[PDB]
Amino acid sequence: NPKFKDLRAYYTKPSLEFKNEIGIILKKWTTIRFMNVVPDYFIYKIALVGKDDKKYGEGVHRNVDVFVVLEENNYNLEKYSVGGITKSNSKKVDHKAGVRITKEDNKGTISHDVSEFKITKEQISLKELDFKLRKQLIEKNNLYGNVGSGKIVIKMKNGGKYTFELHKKLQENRMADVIDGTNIDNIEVNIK
Numbered sequence: 295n296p297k298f299k300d301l302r303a304y305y306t307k308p309s310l311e312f313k314n315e316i317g318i319i320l321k322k323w324t325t326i327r328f329m330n331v332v333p334d335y336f337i338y339k340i341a342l343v344g345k346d347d348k349k350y351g352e353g354v355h356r357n358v359d360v361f362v363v364l365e366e367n368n369y370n371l372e373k374y375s376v377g378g379i380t381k382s383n384s385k386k387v388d389h390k391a392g393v394r395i396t397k398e399d400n401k402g403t404i405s406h407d408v409s410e411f412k413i414t415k416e417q418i419s420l421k422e423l424d425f426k427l428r429k430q431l432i433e434k435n436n437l438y439g440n441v442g443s444g445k446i447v448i449k450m451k452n453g454g455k456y457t458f459e460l461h462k463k464l465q466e467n468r469m470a471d472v473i474d475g476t477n478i479d480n481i482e483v484n485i486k
């Protein structure tokens with residue numbers, strides 16, 4: 295009940311997608327480092343968390359895509375987002391993955407729904423997957439209305455999996471983890 299409010303608000307935030315941009319990293323001036331992205335005359339500050347800190351050194355980084363979710367921060371920054379950095383596509387991707395949703399309402403009834411998640415990137419961040427999928431589950435399945443727990447599992451063609459626990463926000467460090475979008479096989483969602 296109480297926890298759903300915060301999650302529903304976060305996962306209904308607006309997002310932005312920047313592709314084929316350049317990232318600019320200057321000397322560390324605070325506790326976390328940032329990649330600056332300037333698509334159209336405003337500077338986006340992307341926190342470098344988890345694996346991204348060692349992945350991007352000072353200087354210019356070409357072929358950068360960013361999945362952006364602006365949010366509040368303790369650094370006094372106006373256009374701040376965490377993770378979501380990937381390598382731009384070498385060429386167009388036109389792929390898709392079936393989503394299988396099992397939901398048990400607050401009355402015990404078990405239902406099923408299906409959707410198709412469209413994949414247009416070779417490399418996709420767990421940030422993007424987690425965010426887009428939860429937003430879809432809120433809009434179409436009322437996630438965080440009556441029920442707000444369970445899991446999203448991204449199943450890969452090689453047998454790998456990536457799990458997002460629905461009762462809390464995706465851990466920040468994992469927002470920088472990236473996977474092969476073309477190798478996503480299907481997605482399983484269980485809400486309870």
Ligand SMILES: CC(=O)N[C@@H]1[C@@H](O[C@@H]2O[C@@H](C)[C@@H](O)[C@@H](O)[C@@H]2O)[C@H](O[C@@H]2O[C@H](CO)[C@H](O)[C@H](O[C@]3(C(=O)O)C[C@H](O)[C@@H](NC(C)=O)[C@H]([C@H](O)[C@H](O)CO)O3)[C@H]2O)[C@@H](CO)O[C@@H]1O
Pocket residue numbers: 420454455456457458459465466467468471
């Ligand atoms: C304090 C904190 O934020 N710690 C996180 C780890 O999360 C904690 O430990 C977990 C075991 C769990 O108890 C969680 O609730 C805690 O916050 C985090 O560990 C990942 O947690 C997620 C669930 O939130 C998964 O359990 C993940 O295991 C898997 C996965 O299913 O997603 C296993 C899977 O085999 C593996 N896939 C491959 C191909 O290797 C994936 C994958 O490594 C991750 O999804 C990539 O993000 O992991 C736990 O690893 C941990 C992940 O690095 O980060 C902080 O330490």
Ligand SMILES: [Cl-]
Pocket residue numbers: 453454455
């Ligand atoms: Cl695995």
